[PDB]
Design a protein around this ligand. Sequence first.
Ligand SMILES: *[C@H](C)[C@H]1/C(=C/c2[nH]c(/C=C3N=C(/C=C4\NC(=O)C(CC)=C4C)C(C)=C/3CCC(=O)O)c(CCC(=O)O)c2C)NC(=O)[C@@H]1C
Ligand SMILES: *[C@H](C)[C@H]1/C(=C/c2[nH]c(/C=C3N=C(/C=C4\NC(=O)C(CC)=C4C)C(C)=C\3CCC(=O)O)c(CCC(=O)O)c2C)NC(=O)[C@@H]1C
Ligand SMILES: *[C@H](C)[C@H]1/C(=C/c2[nH]c(/C=C3N=C(/C=C4\NC(=O)C(CC)=C4C)C(C)=C\3CCC(=O)O)c(CCC(=O)O)c2C)NC(=O)[C@@H]1C
Ligand SMILES: CCC1=C(C)/C(=C/C2=NC(=C\c3[nH]c(/C=C4\NC(=O)[C@H](C)[C@H]4CC)c(C)c3CCC(=O)O)/C(CCC(=O)O)=C2C)NC1=O
Ligand SMILES: CCC1=C(C)/C(=C/C2=NC(=C\c3[nH]c(/C=C4\NC(=O)[C@H](C)[C@H]4CC)c(C)c3CCC(=O)O)/C(CCC(=O)O)=C2C)NC1=O
Ligand SMILES: CCC1=C(C)/C(=C/C2=NC(=C\c3[nH]c(/C=C4\NC(=O)[C@H](C)[C@H]4CC)c(C)c3CCC(=O)O)/C(CCC(=O)O)=C2C)NC1=O
Ligand SMILES: CCC1=C(C)/C(=C/C2=NC(=C\c3[nH]c(/C=C4\NC(=O)[C@H](C)[C@H]4CC)c(C)c3CCC(=O)O)/C(CCC(=O)O)=C2C)NC1=O
Ligand SMILES: CCC1=C(C)/C(=C/C2=NC(=C\c3[nH]c(/C=C4\NC(=O)[C@H](C)[C@H]4CC)c(C)c3CCC(=O)O)/C(CCC(=O)O)=C2C)NC1=O
Ligand SMILES: CCC1=C(C)/C(=C/C2=NC(=C\c3[nH]c(/C=C4\NC(=O)[C@H](C)[C@H]4CC)c(C)c3CCC(=O)O)/C(CCC(=O)O)=C2C)NC1=O
Lengths: 160, 160, 160, 160, 36, 189, 46, 65, 161, 161, 161, 161
Amino acid sequence: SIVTKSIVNADAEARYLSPGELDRIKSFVTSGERRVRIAETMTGARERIIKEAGNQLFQKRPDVVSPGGNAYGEEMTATCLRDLDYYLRLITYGIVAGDVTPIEEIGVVGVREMYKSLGTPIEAVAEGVRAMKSVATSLLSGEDAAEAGAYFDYLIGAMS
Amino acid sequence: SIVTKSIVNADAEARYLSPGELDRIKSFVTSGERRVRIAETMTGARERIIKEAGNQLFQKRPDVVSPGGNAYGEEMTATCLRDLDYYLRLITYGIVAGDVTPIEEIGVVGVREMYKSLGTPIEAVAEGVRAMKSVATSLLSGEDAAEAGAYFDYLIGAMS
Amino acid sequence: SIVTKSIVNADAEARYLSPGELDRIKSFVTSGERRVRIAETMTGARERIIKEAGNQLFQKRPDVVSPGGNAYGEEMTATCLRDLDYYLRLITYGIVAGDVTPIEEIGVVGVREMYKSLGTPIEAVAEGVRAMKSVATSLLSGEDAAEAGAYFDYLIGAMS
Amino acid sequence: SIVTKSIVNADAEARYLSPGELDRIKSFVTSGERRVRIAETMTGARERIIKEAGNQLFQKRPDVVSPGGNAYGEEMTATCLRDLDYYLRLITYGIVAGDVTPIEEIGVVGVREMYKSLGTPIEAVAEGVRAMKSVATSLLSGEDAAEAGAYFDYLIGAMS
Amino acid sequence: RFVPQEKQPKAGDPANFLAMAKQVSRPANTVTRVAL
Amino acid sequence: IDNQIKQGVNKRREQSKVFKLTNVTDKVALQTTIGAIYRQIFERDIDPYVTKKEFTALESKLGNGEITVKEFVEALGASALYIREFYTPYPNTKVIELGTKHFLGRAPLNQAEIRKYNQILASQGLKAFIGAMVNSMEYAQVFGEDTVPYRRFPTLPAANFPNTELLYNQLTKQNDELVVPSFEPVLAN
Amino acid sequence: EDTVPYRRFPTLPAANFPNTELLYNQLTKQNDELVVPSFEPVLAND
Amino acid sequence: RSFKVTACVPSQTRIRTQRELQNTYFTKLVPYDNWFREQQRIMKMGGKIVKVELATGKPGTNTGL
Amino acid sequence: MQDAITSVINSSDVQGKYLDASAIQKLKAYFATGELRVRAATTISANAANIVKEAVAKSLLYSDITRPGGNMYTTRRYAACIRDLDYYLRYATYAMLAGDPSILDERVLNGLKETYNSLGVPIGATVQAIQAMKEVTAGLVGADAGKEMGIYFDYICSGLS
Amino acid sequence: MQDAITSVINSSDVQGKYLDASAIQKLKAYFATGELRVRAATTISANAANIVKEAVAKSLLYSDITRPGGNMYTTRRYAACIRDLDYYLRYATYAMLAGDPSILDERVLNGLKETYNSLGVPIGATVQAIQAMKEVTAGLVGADAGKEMGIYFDYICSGLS
Amino acid sequence: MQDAITSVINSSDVQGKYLDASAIQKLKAYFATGELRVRAATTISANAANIVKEAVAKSLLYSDITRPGGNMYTTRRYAACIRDLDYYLRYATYAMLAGDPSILDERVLNGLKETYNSLGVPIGATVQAIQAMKEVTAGLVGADAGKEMGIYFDYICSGLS
Amino acid sequence: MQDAITSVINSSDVQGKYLDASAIQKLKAYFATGELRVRAATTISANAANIVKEAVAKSLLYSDITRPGGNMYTTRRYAACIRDLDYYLRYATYAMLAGDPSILDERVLNGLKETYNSLGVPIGATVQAIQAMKEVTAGLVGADAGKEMGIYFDYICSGLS
Ligand SMILES: *[C@H](C)[C@H]1/C(=C/c2[nH]c(/C=C3N=C(/C=C4\NC(=O)C(CC)=C4C)C(C)=C/3CCC(=O)O)c(CCC(=O)O)c2C)NC(=O)[C@@H]1C
Ligand SMILES: *[C@H](C)[C@H]1/C(=C/c2[nH]c(/C=C3N=C(/C=C4\NC(=O)C(CC)=C4C)C(C)=C\3CCC(=O)O)c(CCC(=O)O)c2C)NC(=O)[C@@H]1C
Ligand SMILES: *[C@H](C)[C@H]1/C(=C/c2[nH]c(/C=C3N=C(/C=C4\NC(=O)C(CC)=C4C)C(C)=C\3CCC(=O)O)c(CCC(=O)O)c2C)NC(=O)[C@@H]1C
Ligand SMILES: CCC1=C(C)/C(=C/C2=NC(=C\c3[nH]c(/C=C4\NC(=O)[C@H](C)[C@H]4CC)c(C)c3CCC(=O)O)/C(CCC(=O)O)=C2C)NC1=O
Ligand SMILES: CCC1=C(C)/C(=C/C2=NC(=C\c3[nH]c(/C=C4\NC(=O)[C@H](C)[C@H]4CC)c(C)c3CCC(=O)O)/C(CCC(=O)O)=C2C)NC1=O
Ligand SMILES: CCC1=C(C)/C(=C/C2=NC(=C\c3[nH]c(/C=C4\NC(=O)[C@H](C)[C@H]4CC)c(C)c3CCC(=O)O)/C(CCC(=O)O)=C2C)NC1=O
Ligand SMILES: CCC1=C(C)/C(=C/C2=NC(=C\c3[nH]c(/C=C4\NC(=O)[C@H](C)[C@H]4CC)c(C)c3CCC(=O)O)/C(CCC(=O)O)=C2C)NC1=O
Ligand SMILES: CCC1=C(C)/C(=C/C2=NC(=C\c3[nH]c(/C=C4\NC(=O)[C@H](C)[C@H]4CC)c(C)c3CCC(=O)O)/C(CCC(=O)O)=C2C)NC1=O
Ligand SMILES: CCC1=C(C)/C(=C/C2=NC(=C\c3[nH]c(/C=C4\NC(=O)[C@H](C)[C@H]4CC)c(C)c3CCC(=O)O)/C(CCC(=O)O)=C2C)NC1=O
């Protein structure tokens, strides 16, 4: 994580890592006990978030809800509802990791060539996780939502 | 500073700043009032490190002030104190920047050519920063000198 | 005066008098009796200024009074006093008209090549006005001594 | 030289060099080494001409070394040996050149507003070359003082 | 020690420095009387 | 001298030597090639710009033979010393005329070769930009995988020649301005 | 003293000709930059 | 992650006075993302590869690169 | 490139001094604004393709240049104008996090007066673009947060002119 | 880039129109010269090495330039000058087969004036050689293709001088 | 290459499902030990030349391997032999800060089985050189942190011979 | 790049003549003094870190220029100036063994005046270091070679000033 993001940065310049990094890694571990609190809030909400936001993108975009869209059918509306379960379960690894190196390689790298092969609109899932972001700030206590909500904001700004 | 390392790390990606890098400024600026409440005493107590740096060097390295050594007699105990007075500032300059990269571009990155040529041993100036390390940690509190002591220790590893 | 100064640019572009020029003509008719008043202060302090400000010129510049310069004895210093009592009158003639052009068309336009063709250093006349500066501000209230002090101000910068 | 002067007359007339002007060039190079023989009397005794003029400068104009003048003290009086040797080196350039075109390029065209901004008197320079005229021609032969005295008179003419 | 020790292309005064008296003028000198 | 040195091939194109790497188990022949990589990629000495010898890990992988010089030119220019020296204080159209100076040893070829790398440099960083140059075909037959890049003197594209001696007669950091902004379109569309 | 000034075409000074058609082929307010900054000194000191 | 490739390739267009054994036979370490391009470059000269087992190891992993 | 907090550093070190009291106060003006700057940094990064998405529609689209005859009509040239306007937004984000125009004149202002004249692309439409980018970035970060954003935009469009 | 068929295409493209009646007969004017440009380009390509070796003997030999000090003195430079002239022939047969002289500004006359001024090549001896080359290749293609070949040398010949 | 942090993340996706409370306790066991293993990194980054100096001076500075014959006779075969030692010490800091011995498998221990054999290099000197190097770090970082780095340091011994 | 062998053998080439008796006295002058040059060449390289050391102690060090505000205060560049002063030392020896200042035009004075004013380094302080280096060399090698090596030192001071 923030170890391995920094360790590969220290190895690329071939040296012992900075004391600027030493205040980074010390603050991560001493704030990790509330960082695991954010992950267990998503355990009991794992049906509550995805039930509202998939319908919220269906009313933000009713392009999809008609025959001729991409989620249209009981295996096809279950396609995007399950992929929204994946992206929630993706970045909850990255809350307690504290940076983007778990989310980016197994979520973000091959996307644009995949979704054009899958026929899905990239702008749909871009505003779909925007619907996932807004309810995540409500159940948490503001500031800890604000440090974990930026990984949502990483995921919005890296599709398109 | 801590921003400037992340800026060229952003442009080598040529992307935006990832939120693994954003919070490391959020830990920096809210402790920025804390960090300026560290080094200003080291600007304040100026002489007290310096006169306790030379005499704490000369008992651990007495062959420097012998005849034949570079530093010898008068006017060559003061410029070795004044070249040591230079490297006192950059410890404070690394603290208020929150990173060791302004120490490099004015004070580290060309030491192995100019101290090769001048004949001053780079190990012997490294022990002087190790001599002035103990007198600066006493002037600060113990959890405050623990981060500032590593700022010495990078220059230790850069000299040695 | 100001009525000629407001028209000589205006008639050169062949137009009536601008609204932003008549107000200075208007406010001079409100505030020109102070210029009547401070002219009468300079008449009563006519010889009173240069009994020590001329001495203040010889205090800071004893170059000219020595054998070798220009001023020798009583007479030659008296003609310097006559030239400097030609000079306090000219600014007193200039404050009652309220411009630089009463000062300009008598003494300032030919100030340079006369004095280079006389042996008089043109820098040395400026300290006598600089000694006339500190007494004329001090003999007046500081409200009126600003703007009448501002009328020596062009007369300083056109010597050197 | 005449060659960089008679060309500039002939280029402005857009003609060839007229053979009346060629005999000025033809009589130049045969009388050239006699003009060179003037110059080693100048640059040989060039430490003696500056000493014989400068005290004679400060007997004719003894007032620049007065306190509160322009050049009093050890450092400012020592400029005037360099400020006269600058003209002494320029004059012996011209007798070698045969004409005035080194002097008017180097020392003449901005002599006023440099010295007027410095506050130095012009006529003290004008007697300083005039002190240097009679000293150098007394070291010079009877025909040679007539020709080389005229180049001194241009530098008096430069200030006039 | 320190001692930079360079060269130069100016100076070398042979000191002279004669000096003088400096007397003040009484504030009454006839401003008016100069000539004809 | 006007007919001597001033004939049009400025005689250092065909008397400057190149460096091969046939001798990977030789050690002193390796050391003057590694300096030749340093004096062509960064093209100064790298001695006053490094806190400590920095690349001596992957310098030591060379000579052991499990990397090549095409490895060693690519990963060195990808490192953070090339970012600090040649990527930060210059525009990303200067970098295209600076990356082609050291790697591949020429000017940019066409207007489209500016468009090719600026397509790359906006999407990915210098990471995939430096992978796009040395793994191209034009690196492969004129340099090869055993040679250092060197300054070479093209003849076939029109603006390829005089933009090299407006790139190489300058020294390093001589001008902040880029020498060729782009290539001129000759007509409407 | 009876003629209007007009655009004239010099020949005798060297840089006088091509700095006129770098002054007249431009229209008015065509460039904010001055066309010739100054003239080049050719050697060390003159 | 990286591979340990070895391959053989001749050049067709020219006859070279230098030796080129290291140019006609490789044993290179190449990383994972250059290998999508580095393998294709030997196809254009038509050279054969032989042993392409990875040296960095850990296949089939998801994260950790 | 250098930080605003390192602008305090090198200017006090060309004079050879230490951190003095007003030079502490130069950092203290930074440390009251930095926590808003990083809160502004998230919304511009998440909407990096959702600021230019509205901006080109707000000023550039359905005009002469998107029609044939103009410049933006061919898809190669439209692919650069989406690229260059994303490019200025990323470097203005670097201007806001550093608090400096020092990154802009190094990179995006050295050749920009010359690369745009050589390609024939109009400078004045870019002046309309980033001023419209200045308006559309304030609508989603806030006029309190867009004001510190709205300094270096005027540093950009001055350098175009 | 710019062809002759593309020239009437790109003029029709920036208007946004289609193939109009005047745009078709100009496009059919290129096809009416279609047998001339193909047959002449086969003739020059078969006689490339003989039309060069007459053109250097017609103008360049037995002068100052083939003597010591001249720019085609040595065996590097006289072998270079044949190749540097042969690109003027081969690209002129590109411009005939294109039917438009804008292939010369893209790939011949771009930095060519900047090279030869920096190299000490006599431009007026080059433009004398191409002008001698234009006459001798008009006798090999006939008077019909000799006008169309004779244009495209003097688009090169005015780009040099 | 992965740490102990993304060890449990990589096992979470091979099993596919979200990580449960036993996997949570494996992750937060790092956090009880995270603040002390960074305290080892403070003092090991300072004196990194000191650890590799006296470990030579323990048993490798007056030795038969340093006298004619051997493998540290010349200064160049010296210049790798000390260069391997801080490379083990740097990557031991890389191992002990991440909890995983998998970092130095592919970066250090990839070719060390056969490159020390093919070059005629004694491993039995370097295995002797590191067990004295292991004991001096635990005195310098403290016994609370020196134990846990040793099992990443004795991990190097299992891959060496 | 040329040589006193080659510059008198190429200038006689470009005139078209052969080895003239006036041209034969320059080669035999170079063949007479060539044994003096090659013993003078080795003594520079044996003292190359000490000619540069005594130059900066006699001209550069302990002044305002190494005091903050001067250009030498950054130790990035005091490493670079010893690198810069090494360049004039080795290229003077290359001008000495060639007997020719022609390498200094093409490899030192190509664009050297523009790149020093682009950084704002002092011109005369470097010229004062060349005046330091010419007397240190003439003492260490003997005055018969220092009176020839210093000629190419004055060729550097002519181009730098
Ligand atoms: C040092 C005696 C003076 C000085 C120097 C200063 N120099 C810097 C140096 C540069 N020097 C060069 C020069 C050459 N490169 C070459 O290849 C050759 C011929 C073989 C020469 C003569 C160049 C190209 C640079 C700048 C490029 C770079 O940054 O590497 C700097 C460095 C620029 C910077 O911003 O760091 C400084 C101060 N100042 C003094 O005090 C001495 C007078
Ligand atoms: C020959 C009749 C005349 C002449 C020629 C000459 N040219 C050179 C050098 C060059 N010529 C070129 C030309 C081109 N490059 C292009 O891309 C194109 C468009 C396709 C052209 C026409 C270039 C780049 C050079 C310089 C380097 C090179 O040769 O590749 C030389 C000699 C210089 C050398 O180093 O070989 C000569 C002699 N000179 C004459 O005297 C004739 C009048
Ligand atoms: C878009 C809003 C405006 C516009 C843009 C336009 N730009 C180009 C081409 C280039 N622009 C640049 C400049 C830079 N590229 C960079 O990467 C950087 C620094 C990070 C700068 C300063 C360059 C180099 C090009 C050329 C190729 C490239 O894109 O890199 C074009 C294409 C012009 C052409 O004919 O190819 C266009 C159309 N044009 C508009 O209409 C808008 C006002
Ligand atoms: C995290 C990385 C990841 C992705 C992307 C992923 C995609 C994925 N999408 C699938 C189906 C699908 N998913 C979609 C998705 C969509 N259509 C819509 O209506 C929406 C607009 C849009 C998503 C929001 C579609 C259309 C299919 C069926 C395939 C097809 O016929 O096109 C299936 C097949 C069913 C199965 O799982 O057995 C997989 C594996 N799995 C992954 O692990
Ligand atoms: C901020 C970055 C920076 C660094 C690193 C720096 C080093 C530096 N040390 C110098 C001198 C010196 N430095 C020493 C130092 C020492 N002698 C010894 O024996 C001891 C080992 C050692 C220090 C304890 C001595 C003796 C000199 C004078 C050299 C001489 O007189 O020969 C000088 C030349 C004179 C000066 O300007 O001070 C520089 C430039 N200057 C800088 O601006
Ligand atoms: C206000 C308008 C005005 C000015 C400027 C002016 C200057 C002036 N100064 C004169 C003389 C003089 N003026 C001075 C005055 C000085 N010489 C110095 O070196 C001192 C700096 C300065 C003393 C303050 C002297 C010494 C002479 C006589 C010069 C001589 O006879 O050699 C004369 C000739 C005699 C006369 O008519 O007074 C004029 C016209 N007269 C005017 O009506
Ligand atoms: C060859 C062309 C040439 C000219 C004209 C020239 C003028 C010149 N005169 C100067 C100074 C000076 N010149 C003088 C003049 C004098 N001292 C006196 O007391 C008398 C009034 C007078 C002549 C004897 C004085 C006093 C200074 C120093 C000014 C100061 O430092 O305040 C200076 C500044 C320092 C210096 O270089 O000396 C210049 C450049 N330099 C040149 O290279
Ligand atoms: C020629 C290639 C070569 C070198 C460089 C070399 C160095 C070398 N120096 C050693 C020790 C040493 N060598 C020195 C040498 C010196 N310190 C001083 O005081 C003097 C200035 C200087 C030499 C005169 C010292 C002090 C030690 C002992 C270090 C210690 O005990 O910590 C050792 C371990 C002892 C041994 O030889 O077995 C080696 C291998 N051996 C070689 O074969
Ligand atoms: C971190 C990544 C990395 C690794 C793993 C690495 C290993 C490595 N060790 C090597 C050599 C060496 N390794 C040693 C090792 C030792 N000296 C002894 O006597 C003991 C047996 C042992 C330690 C005390 C020696 C003597 C050589 C030189 C062999 C030679 O060059 O002949 C070489 C051959 C090239 C060279 O000379 O450096 C490699 C590649 N290099 C790397 O960059």
